[PDB]
Design a protein around this motif. Structure first.
Motif, PDB file in Angstrom:
ATOM      1  N   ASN A  30      31.066  -0.627 -26.141  1.00 40.33           N
ATOM      2  CA  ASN A  30      30.900   0.890 -26.867  1.00 40.33           C
ATOM      3  C   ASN A  30      31.533   0.441 -28.276  1.00 40.33           C
ATOM      4  N   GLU A  31      30.266   0.285 -29.070  1.00 40.32           N
ATOM      5  CA  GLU A  31      30.610   0.230 -30.678  1.00 40.32           C
ATOM      6  C   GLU A  31      30.428   1.970 -31.422  1.00 40.32           C
ATOM      7  N   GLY A  32      30.605   2.852 -30.255  1.00 42.20           N
ATOM      8  CA  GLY A  32      30.851   4.159 -30.756  1.00 42.20           C
ATOM      9  C   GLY A  32      32.236   4.770 -30.955  1.00 42.20           C
ATOM     10  N   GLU A  65      36.210   4.668 -17.130  1.00 44.01           N
ATOM     11  CA  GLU A  65      36.076   4.946 -18.450  1.00 44.01           C
ATOM     12  C   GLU A  65      35.700   3.392 -19.306  1.00 44.01           C
ATOM     13  N   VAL A  66      34.685   3.755 -20.403  1.00 40.50           N
ATOM     14  CA  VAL A  66      34.177   2.913 -21.190  1.00 40.50           C
ATOM     15  C   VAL A  66      34.761   3.382 -22.857  1.00 40.50           C
ATOM     16  N   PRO A  67      36.013   2.576 -23.271  1.00 37.68           N
ATOM     17  CA  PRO A  67      36.666   3.128 -24.351  1.00 37.68           C
ATOM     18  C   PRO A  67      35.734   2.821 -25.737  1.00 37.68           C
ATOM     19  N   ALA A  68      36.145   3.930 -26.671  1.00 35.19           N
ATOM     20  CA  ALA A  68      35.403   4.067 -27.931  1.00 35.19           C
ATOM     21  C   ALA A  68      35.987   2.595 -28.476  1.00 35.19           C
ATOM     22  N   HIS A  69      35.205   1.925 -29.317  1.00 35.33           N
ATOM     23  CA  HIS A  69      35.303   0.580 -30.011  1.00 35.33           C
ATOM     24  C   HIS A  69      36.108  -0.412 -29.106  1.00 35.33           C
ATOM     25  N   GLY A  70      35.657  -0.289 -27.923  1.00 32.81           N
ATOM     26  CA  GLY A  70      36.194  -1.089 -26.958  1.00 32.81           C
ATOM     27  C   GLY A  70      35.167  -1.890 -25.766  1.00 32.81           C
ATOM     28  N   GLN A  71      35.651  -2.258 -24.588  1.00 29.63           N
ATOM     29  CA  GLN A  71      34.859  -2.724 -23.532  1.00 29.63           C
ATOM     30  C   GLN A  71      35.313  -2.319 -22.240  1.00 29.63           C
ATOM     31  N   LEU A  72      34.356  -2.120 -21.265  1.00 28.30           N
ATOM     32  CA  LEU A  72      34.805  -2.141 -19.588  1.00 28.30           C
ATOM     33  C   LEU A  72      34.095  -3.450 -19.137  1.00 28.30           C
ATOM     34  N   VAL A  73      34.925  -4.261 -18.725  1.00 33.35           N
ATOM     35  CA  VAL A  73      34.732  -5.630 -18.324  1.00 33.35           C
ATOM     36  C   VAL A  73      34.764  -5.549 -16.722  1.00 33.35           C
ATOM     37  N   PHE A  74      33.560  -5.999 -15.970  1.00 31.06           N
ATOM     38  CA  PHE A  74      33.631  -6.239 -14.615  1.00 31.06           C
ATOM     39  C   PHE A  74      33.661  -7.731 -14.539  1.00 31.06           C
ATOM     40  N   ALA A 103      28.281   9.165 -18.698  1.00 34.35           N
ATOM     41  CA  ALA A 103      28.454  10.590 -18.748  1.00 34.35           C
ATOM     42  C   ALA A 103      27.729  11.176 -19.966  1.00 34.35           C
ATOM     43  N   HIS A 104      27.810  10.482 -21.256  1.00 36.65           N
ATOM     44  CA  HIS A 104      27.363  11.038 -22.537  1.00 36.65           C
ATOM     45  C   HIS A 104      26.578  10.184 -23.420  1.00 36.65           C
ATOM     46  N   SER A 105      25.920   9.098 -22.631  1.00 35.80           N
ATOM     47  CA  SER A 105      25.121   8.235 -23.212  1.00 35.80           C
ATOM     48  C   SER A 105      23.686   8.028 -22.506  1.00 35.80           C
ATOM     49  N   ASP A 106      22.521   7.622 -22.977  1.00 32.93           N
ATOM     50  CA  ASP A 106      21.423   7.148 -22.177  1.00 32.93           C
ATOM     51  C   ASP A 106      21.575   6.043 -21.371  1.00 32.93           C
TER      52      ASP A 106
END
Length: 117
Positions: A30-32, A65-74, A103-106
């Motif tokens: 997430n670069e947002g 969660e996918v954090p802002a300016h961060g990553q979710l890693v599987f 939730a909040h993205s395409d």
């Protein structure tokens, strides 16, 4: 653009020792400025659920969660996707497609090649 600040890499499935179920790995960046949530994953292959892994045990979650300016890693040993109700053992040479829904993205389509076990 708004609704498109999520990108995916590191996406693969280790060949399972199973004819019905498999793990999927991938990393969501997430670069947002706003956090998001992975809320579902779909696939023509079977059912996909999301699992957090703590001390080699797993816990199914509906949202993650996918954090802002961060990553979710599987990844192996961490959180993972689980493919369920597969029709046969996926094998090296094959690939499985999913659609990630947020939730909040395409949504975001991903291809997950099957690799060595």
């Amino acid at each position: 653009s708004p609704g498109a600040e999520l990108s995916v890499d590191a996406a693969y499935i280790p060949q399972p020792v199973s004819d019905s179920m498999a793990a999927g790995f991938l990393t969501i960046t997430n670069e947002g400025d706003s956090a998001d949530e992975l809320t579902s994953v779909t696939s023509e292959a079977g059912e996909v659920t999301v699992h957090e892994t703590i001390d080699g045990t797993m816990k199914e979650v509906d949202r993650i969660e996918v954090p802002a300016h961060g990553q979710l890693v599987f990844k192996s040993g961490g959180n993972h996707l689980m493919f369920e109700k597969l029709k046969q053992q996926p094998k090296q040479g094959q690939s499985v497609a999913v659609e990630l829904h947020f939730a909040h993205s395409d949504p975001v389509a991903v291809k997950l090649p099957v690799k060595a076990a």
